[PDB]
Ligand binder design. Sequence first.
Ligand code: FMN
Ligand code: FMN
Lengths: 107, 118
Amino acid sequence: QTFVVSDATQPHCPIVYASSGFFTMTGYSSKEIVGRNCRFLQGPDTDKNEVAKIRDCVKNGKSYCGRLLNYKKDGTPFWNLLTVTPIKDDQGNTIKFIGMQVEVSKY
Amino acid sequence: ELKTALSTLQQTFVVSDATQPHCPIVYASSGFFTMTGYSSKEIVGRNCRFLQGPDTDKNEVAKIRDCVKNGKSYCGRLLNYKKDGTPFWNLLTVTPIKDDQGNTIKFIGMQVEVSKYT
Ligand SMILES: Cc1cc2nc3c(=O)[nH]c(=O)nc-3n(C[C@H](O)[C@H](O)[C@H](O)COP(=O)(O)O)c2cc1C
Ligand SMILES: Cc1cc2nc3c(=O)[nH]c(=O)nc-3n(C[C@H](O)[C@H](O)[C@H](O)COP(=O)(O)O)c2cc1C
């Protein structure tokens, strides 16, 4: 599974871990993207309503599941089957999120 | 590796196989025994519904069911019970894992026992 971990205890939820498969999928290196928000995957044709749904989920520490258009480092458009799942502490605070990505195949 | 990232987060989790009838647990992390009192011998190959009991909110359970059945994500809090009967609040996520055709093939469930000071 390709995935990233973002730290919700830091402003704007920066990536703190990218799996080897994220690099394989997107072309971006772990040194290019750690410390950054995952929004860099979006581009001209990404559905902004779907982005707004993710933003709401993230802001409220709840789970997102959906499909959105993203772009690789080289500009290649792909369909990303995405989940973003809050990780909570024992007080119910959202401390991290895990985002899991699947590139929809051509067939 | 996903398992490792999770362990770095000290996160209790299970994985269920949506390709098998009734979505059985195929893997449970060591924290799942610690939290629930159930061994992997008691839990692997079963559905996680065994953690529910008399006062579990059946309307919340229904929301989980409807997410699982439709390959979507659940997030919520419900009353669960340890092997010894102890009730606990379980802050639960259930997240579909999909193949490259959009088929839900597994789920990952992440549990947090709510602290006594909350
Ligand atoms: C852990 C995690 C993983 C994410 N992965 C993606 C991604 O794969 N693709 C994407 O377009 N957005 C992804 N996002 C969503 C963006 O980072 C951001 O939350 C979204 O663009 C909405 O907020 P904004 O409108 O302020 O950008 C992810 C978010 C989190 C927290
Ligand atoms: C991966 C995964 C983890 C789950 N973890 C829990 C859990 O920790 N506690 C719980 O009560 N139910 C858990 N469930 C939900 C139940 O297994 C079941 O889906 C739910 O009770 C609704 O279906 P049912 O009405 O047929 O029982 C989990 C389900 C999945 C797929």
